[PDB]
Design an enzyme around this catalytic site. Structure first.
Site, PDB file in Angstrom:
ATOM      1  N   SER A 119      -2.352 -75.657 -10.826  1.00 31.63           N
ATOM      2  CA  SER A 119      -1.746 -75.250  -9.584  1.00 31.63           C
ATOM      3  C   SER A 119      -0.936 -76.398  -9.040  1.00 31.63           C
ATOM      4  CB  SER A 119      -2.848 -74.890  -8.583  1.00 31.63           C
ATOM      5  OG  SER A 119      -2.334 -74.768  -7.265  1.00 31.63           O
ATOM      6  N   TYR A 131      -1.839 -71.100   4.369  1.00 30.03           N
ATOM      7  CA  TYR A 131      -0.855 -72.164   4.079  1.00 30.03           C
ATOM      8  C   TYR A 131       0.110 -72.403   5.238  1.00 30.03           C
ATOM      9  CZ  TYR A 131      -2.332 -71.003  -0.717  1.00 30.03           C
ATOM     10  OH  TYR A 131      -3.072 -70.755  -1.837  1.00 30.03           O
ATOM     11  N   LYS A 155      -8.468 -77.348 -10.173  1.00 28.40           N
ATOM     12  CA  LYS A 155      -7.274 -77.411 -11.004  1.00 28.40           C
ATOM     13  C   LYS A 155      -6.908 -78.844 -11.387  1.00 28.40           C
ATOM     14  CE  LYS A 155      -7.014 -72.975 -11.038  1.00 28.40           C
ATOM     15  NZ  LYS A 155      -5.668 -72.325 -11.176  1.00 28.40           N
ATOM     16  N   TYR A 206     -10.552 -75.781  -4.407  1.00 25.58           N
ATOM     17  CA  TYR A 206      -9.630 -75.190  -5.368  1.00 25.58           C
ATOM     18  C   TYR A 206      -8.750 -76.242  -5.990  1.00 25.58           C
ATOM     19  CZ  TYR A 206      -5.846 -72.262  -7.234  1.00 25.58           C
ATOM     20  OH  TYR A 206      -4.873 -71.679  -8.027  1.00 25.58           O
TER      21      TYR A 206
HETATM   22  N1  LIG Z   1      -0.383 -66.679  -7.162  1.00 26.33           N
HETATM   23  C1  LIG Z   1      -0.393 -67.976  -6.782  1.00 26.33           C
HETATM   24  O1  LIG Z   1       0.169 -68.315  -5.749  1.00 26.33           O
HETATM   25  C2  LIG Z   1      -1.037 -69.070  -7.611  1.00 26.33           C
HETATM   26  C3  LIG Z   1      -0.793 -70.400  -7.271  1.00 26.33           C
HETATM   27  C4  LIG Z   1      -1.339 -71.415  -8.041  1.00 26.33           C
HETATM   28  C5  LIG Z   1      -2.130 -71.102  -9.127  1.00 26.33           C
HETATM   29  N2  LIG Z   1      -2.376 -69.830  -9.438  1.00 26.33           N
HETATM   30  C6  LIG Z   1      -3.232 -69.550 -10.608  1.00 26.33           C
HETATM   31  O2  LIG Z   1      -2.683 -68.541 -11.481  1.00 26.33           O
HETATM   32  C7  LIG Z   1      -3.783 -67.861 -12.119  1.00 26.33           C
HETATM   33  C8  LIG Z   1      -3.675 -66.372 -11.943  1.00 26.33           C
HETATM   34  O3  LIG Z   1      -3.394 -66.150 -10.553  1.00 26.33           O
HETATM   35  P1  LIG Z   1      -2.892 -64.735 -10.020  1.00 26.33           P
HETATM   36  O4  LIG Z   1      -1.919 -65.017  -8.903  1.00 26.33           O
HETATM   37  O5  LIG Z   1      -2.465 -63.805 -11.114  1.00 26.33           O
HETATM   38  O6  LIG Z   1      -4.333 -64.236  -9.439  1.00 26.33           O
HETATM   39  P2  LIG Z   1      -4.880 -62.742  -9.126  1.00 26.33           P
HETATM   40  O7  LIG Z   1      -3.804 -61.756  -8.805  1.00 26.33           O
HETATM   41  O8  LIG Z   1      -6.061 -62.887  -8.207  1.00 26.33           O
HETATM   42  O9  LIG Z   1      -5.452 -62.376 -10.563  1.00 26.33           O
HETATM   43  C9  LIG Z   1      -6.692 -62.938 -10.987  1.00 26.33           C
HETATM   44  C10 LIG Z   1      -6.824 -62.724 -12.484  1.00 26.33           C
HETATM   45  O10 LIG Z   1      -7.943 -63.467 -12.955  1.00 26.33           O
HETATM   46  C11 LIG Z   1      -8.838 -62.534 -13.585  1.00 26.33           C
HETATM   47  N3  LIG Z   1     -10.269 -62.832 -13.383  1.00 26.33           N
HETATM   48  C12 LIG Z   1     -10.906 -62.952 -12.213  1.00 26.33           C
HETATM   49  N4  LIG Z   1     -12.203 -63.193 -12.427  1.00 26.33           N
HETATM   50  C13 LIG Z   1     -12.411 -63.230 -13.750  1.00 26.33           C
HETATM   51  C14 LIG Z   1     -13.565 -63.449 -14.640  1.00 26.33           C
HETATM   52  N5  LIG Z   1     -14.780 -63.683 -14.102  1.00 26.33           N
HETATM   53  N6  LIG Z   1     -13.358 -63.393 -15.972  1.00 26.33           N
HETATM   54  C15 LIG Z   1     -12.131 -63.160 -16.479  1.00 26.33           C
HETATM   55  N7  LIG Z   1     -11.033 -62.964 -15.728  1.00 26.33           N
HETATM   56  C16 LIG Z   1     -11.125 -62.989 -14.384  1.00 26.33           C
HETATM   57  C17 LIG Z   1      -8.558 -61.169 -12.974  1.00 26.33           C
HETATM   58  O11 LIG Z   1      -8.987 -60.104 -13.806  1.00 26.33           O
HETATM   59  P3  LIG Z   1      -9.937 -58.914 -13.307  1.00 26.33           P
HETATM   60  O12 LIG Z   1      -9.203 -58.171 -12.197  1.00 26.33           O
HETATM   61  O13 LIG Z   1     -10.114 -58.112 -14.571  1.00 26.33           O
HETATM   62  O14 LIG Z   1     -11.258 -59.536 -12.924  1.00 26.33           O
HETATM   63  C18 LIG Z   1      -7.054 -61.258 -12.844  1.00 26.33           C
HETATM   64  O15 LIG Z   1      -6.424 -60.912 -14.091  1.00 26.33           O
HETATM   65  C19 LIG Z   1      -5.068 -68.379 -11.506  1.00 26.33           C
HETATM   66  O16 LIG Z   1      -5.622 -69.355 -12.412  1.00 26.33           O
HETATM   67  C20 LIG Z   1      -4.628 -69.049 -10.231  1.00 26.33           C
HETATM   68  O17 LIG Z   1      -5.487 -70.148  -9.915  1.00 26.33           O
HETATM   69  C21 LIG Z   1      -1.841 -68.814  -8.714  1.00 26.33           C
HETATM   70  O1  LIG Z   2       2.632 -71.977  -0.759  1.00 25.32           O
HETATM   71  C1  LIG Z   2       2.122 -70.908  -0.396  1.00 25.32           C
HETATM   72  C2  LIG Z   2       2.513 -70.277   0.873  1.00 25.32           C
HETATM   73  C3  LIG Z   2       3.467 -70.911   1.830  1.00 25.32           C
HETATM   74  C4  LIG Z   2       3.557 -72.313   1.931  1.00 25.32           C
HETATM   75  C5  LIG Z   2       4.409 -72.917   2.850  1.00 25.32           C
HETATM   76  C6  LIG Z   2       5.140 -72.118   3.716  1.00 25.32           C
HETATM   77  O2  LIG Z   2       5.989 -72.639   4.649  1.00 25.32           O
HETATM   78  C7  LIG Z   2       5.012 -70.734   3.643  1.00 25.32           C
HETATM   79  C8  LIG Z   2       4.184 -70.127   2.715  1.00 25.32           C
HETATM   80  C9  LIG Z   2       1.905 -69.063   1.228  1.00 25.32           C
HETATM   81  O3  LIG Z   2       1.012 -68.434   0.470  1.00 25.32           O
HETATM   82  C10 LIG Z   2       0.564 -68.914  -0.723  1.00 25.32           C
HETATM   83  C11 LIG Z   2      -0.371 -68.209  -1.472  1.00 25.32           C
HETATM   84  C12 LIG Z   2      -0.826 -68.715  -2.695  1.00 25.32           C
HETATM   85  O4  LIG Z   2      -1.771 -68.007  -3.389  1.00 25.32           O
HETATM   86  C13 LIG Z   2      -0.343 -69.927  -3.212  1.00 25.32           C
HETATM   87  C14 LIG Z   2       0.605 -70.674  -2.524  1.00 25.32           C
HETATM   88  O5  LIG Z   2       1.068 -71.839  -3.019  1.00 25.32           O
HETATM   89  C15 LIG Z   2       1.109 -70.191  -1.224  1.00 25.32           C
END
Ligand SMILES: NC(=O)c1ccc[n+]([C@@H]2O[C@H](COP(=O)([O-])OP(=O)(O)OC[C@H]3O[C@@H](n4cnc5c(N)ncnc54)[C@H](OP(=O)(O)O)[C@@H]3O)[C@@H](O)[C@H]2O)c1
Ligand SMILES: O=c1c(-c2ccc(O)cc2)coc2cc(O)cc(O)c12
Ligand SMILES: NC(=O)c1ccc[n+]([C@@H]2O[C@H](COP(=O)([O-])OP(=O)(O)OC[C@H]3O[C@@H](n4cnc5c(N)ncnc54)[C@H](OP(=O)(O)O)[C@@H]3O)[C@@H](O)[C@H]2O)c1
Lengths: 259, 261
Positions: free
Chosen positions: A142, A201, A160, A156
Site C-alpha cells: 500500500s 482519510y 503492508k 494497516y
Molecule cells: N482500494 C484501495 O484503496 C487500496 C489501497 C491500498 C492497498 N490496497 C490493497 O489492495 C488489495 C485488494 O484491495 P481491494 O481494494 O480490492 O479490497 P476489497 O474490495 O475489500 O477486496 C478484498 C479482497 O480480498 C479478499 N479476501 C478477503 N478476505 C479474505 C480471506 N480471508 N481469504 C482470501 N481472500 C480474502 C476478498 O475476497 P472475498 O470477498 O471472497 O472474501 C476480496 O477479493 C488489498 O491487499 C488491499 O490492502 C487497496
Molecule cells: O487516499 C485515500 C482517500 C483520500 C485521501 C486524501 C484526500 O484528500 C481525499 C481522499 C480516500 O479514501 C481512500 C480509501 C482507501 O481505501 C485508500 C486510500 O488511499 C484512500
C-alpha cells in the site's frame, strides 16, 4: 507477442472482486489461464471465471481462506492439479483497518496481520514451492506503508510495511528458481474497500458525501482522476511478463503521482 | 557549563534489558539520571546486575519479569511500573529474536515465534506506553538495518518483522502527538551481543568458511570506521532520542550501522 502470457498459468488471491478481479481478467486477456481464488464471494468469482472464458482463455474458481496456511497449501495443490503447472502467483487478498493506537485490540491486530502479512507470506512460500522455473510472484502492499501517512492507520500501514521488506528478500531466495518477486503498493483505488473507509482519510470525512470523498481522492493525483482496479492490473501484467524480469525485489507505488 | 541530554526526574522502562542492547540502554538511561524499570523474560540474574549497576550510578531501578509475547503481561508490566515509581515518561521497546531460513522452509510456528515478539509484542508495548506515559513522553521501538538498508538471503521473516515496525512508528507518531509523545525507532546493524553470533555467518559473504573472531573482524570492516557496532552505540542514540533535545526527531527510523549502508 511481447507482454503476453499465452501458455502460462496464473493464480490471483481474492480475485472475485476489486483489484484482484481486474488483475485476474487482465491476465486472462494477456493469454494466461487463471485460478480465481475467493474466500466468500462465490458468485462474483464465477462471474470473473466466465469473463475470462468469454475473452477466449480458461479459468477456475477455487475457495480458500488465505488466513489458513493449510488452505493456502490446498489452494496451490488444486491449482496445479487442474491446470498441470503454475507460472504466476499474485497475492492480492487483504483487509483495511482504522483506529487510534490506544484502542487497537489483540483481535484486530490478528484479523489484519493474519491475512495481510502472514497470509501473503505463506502464499509466497507455496508459490515458490509450486511454481515453474522462470515464474513470477507479486504481493500487494500500500502507499500507506511508506509514502502516505494517515492518522489512526498504524496497524494497516505496518501490515503492508512487512510486505515491502518481504519481497526484497524473497527475490534473493526465489532466484534459485529464477522466480522474480515484487509488490504493487496502490494508493486510493475505487473498490468496495475505498467506499468503506474513504471518510477516514479526510478531516470531517463523514460530513461529505461518498461521491465528494471520491472526487477529493481524485484531486490528490496530479492527473486529477481516481485510481481504478485496471490501473493496478496493467502494472501487474507487465511485472509478470517476460519483459518485466529486470524488475525484481521491488515495491512499486501506484498512486498516479500523489506521493 | 551546559550539560546536554540528561533525564533527571524521569522514569524509563526498557523491555528485554537484562542483556544485550537492552542492558546498555537501561544502564545508560540511568547514567543520564532516569529511574529505570528493567524488564526481562528469562535472564533473572542479568536483570539484577543491570538494576545494581543503575543504583551504583546513583539512580534507582527495579527488575520486572514479563513475557512480551503476552499482551496481558505487557499491561501488568506497565501498571506495576507506574505503581512503583508513580509515573512513566520513557518506554523503550527492545526485546526481539532473530531467524534465518529460505522462504521455502519457513513454518507457521517460526513465523509466529518471530512476529509474536518482534512485531505484535512491540505494537502492544507501544499501545501500553501511550496509555501509561506522561505528556511530553518518549517511545522508541527497535527495528533493524535488514528492514530496508541491508538485504540478506534467507532473512525474509525477520526483515519483514522489522519492516512493520518502521511503518508503525511513522503513524504512531501521529496518534501519540495528542499527548505530545514522540515515537521513533532505532535500526541497528550488526551489534556485538548474543544475537550477533546468530547473524554473523549470514551477514558476511561466505560467512560459514570463517571463524567467529574473523567474522567479527569482517563485520567491523563493513563500516567505513573499521570497527563493530556495540550495545553502547545504540544506547547513545536512544539516550538522545528520549531526551528533551531529541524532540524534533519524531516518527523516524534511524539506521545505526556506522555507515555500512
Ligand atoms: N482500494 C484501495 O484503496 C487500496 C489501497 C491500498 C492497498 N490496497 C490493497 O489492495 C488489495 C485488494 O484491495 P481491494 O481494494 O480490492 O479490497 P476489497 O474490495 O475489500 O477486496 C478484498 C479482497 O480480498 C479478499 N479476501 C478477503 N478476505 C479474505 C480471506 N480471508 N481469504 C482470501 N481472500 C480474502 C476478498 O475476497 P472475498 O470477498 O471472497 O472474501 C476480496 O477479493 C488489498 O491487499 C488491499 O490492502 C487497496
Ligand atoms: O487516499 C485515500 C482517500 C483520500 C485521501 C486524501 C484526500 O484528500 C481525499 C481522499 C480516500 O479514501 C481512500 C480509501 C482507501 O481505501 C485508500 C486510500 O488511499 C484512500
Ligand atoms: N545484535 C544485532 O546485531 C541486532 C541487529 C539488528 C537489530 N537487533 C534488534 O535489537 C534488539 C535487541 O537485540 P540483542 O542484539 O540485544 O539480542 P539478544 O542479545 O539475543 O537479546 C535479546 C533480548 O530480548 C529479550 N527477550 C527475548 N524474548 C523475550 C520475551 N518473550 N519477552 C521479553 N523479552 C524477551 C531477552 O530477554 P531474556 O533474556 O530475559 O529472555 C533479551 O534481553 C532486538 O529487537 C533485535 O531484533 C539486533
Amino acid at each position: 507477442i511481447p507482454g503476453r502470457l499465452d501458455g502460462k498459468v496464473a493464480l490471483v488471491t481474492g480475485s472475485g472482486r476489486g483489484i484482484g478481479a481486474a488483475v485476474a481478467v487482465h491476465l486472462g486477456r494477456l493469454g494466461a489461464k487463471v485460478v480465481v481464488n475467493y474466500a466468500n464471494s462465490t458468485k462474483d468469482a464465477e462471474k470473473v471465471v466466465s469473463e475470462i472464458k468469454a475473452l477466449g482463455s480458461d479459468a477456475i474458481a477455487i475457495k480458500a481462506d488465505i488466513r489458513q496456511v493449510p488452505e493456502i497449501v490446498k489452494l496451490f495443490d488444486q491449482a496445479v492439479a487442474h491446470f498441470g503447472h503454475l507460472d504466476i502467483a499474485v497475492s492480492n487478498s487483504g483487509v483495511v483497518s482504522f483506529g487510534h493506537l490506544k484502542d487497537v485490540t489483540e483481535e484486530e491486530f490478528d484479523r489484519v496481520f493474519s491475512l495481510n502479512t502472514r497470509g501473503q507470506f505463506f502464499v509466497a512460500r507455496e508459490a515458490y514451492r509450486h511454481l515453474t522455473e522462470g515464474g513470477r510472484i507479486v504481493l500487494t502492499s500500500s502507499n500507506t506503508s511508506k509514502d502516505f501517512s494517515v492518522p489512526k492507520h498504524s496497524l494497516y500501514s505496518g501490515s503492508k510495511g512487512a510486505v515491502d521488506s518481504f519481497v526484497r528478500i524473497f527475490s534473493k531466495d526465489c532466484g534459485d528458481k529464477k522466480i522474480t518477486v515484487n509488490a504493487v503498493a496502490p494508493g486510493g483505488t475505487v473498490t468496495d474497500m475505498f467506499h468503506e473507509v474513504s471518510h477516514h482519510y479526510i478531516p470531517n470525512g463523514t460530513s461529505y458525501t461518498a461521491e465528494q470523498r471520491q472526487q477529493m481522492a481524485a484531486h490528490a493525483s496530479p492527473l486529477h482522476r481516481n485510481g481504478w482496479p485496471q490501473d493496478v492490473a496493467n502494472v501487474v501484467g507487465f511485472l509478470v511478463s517476460k519483459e518485466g524480469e529486470w524488475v525484481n525485489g521491488k515495491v512499486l507505488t501506484l498512486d498516479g503521482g500523489a506521493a
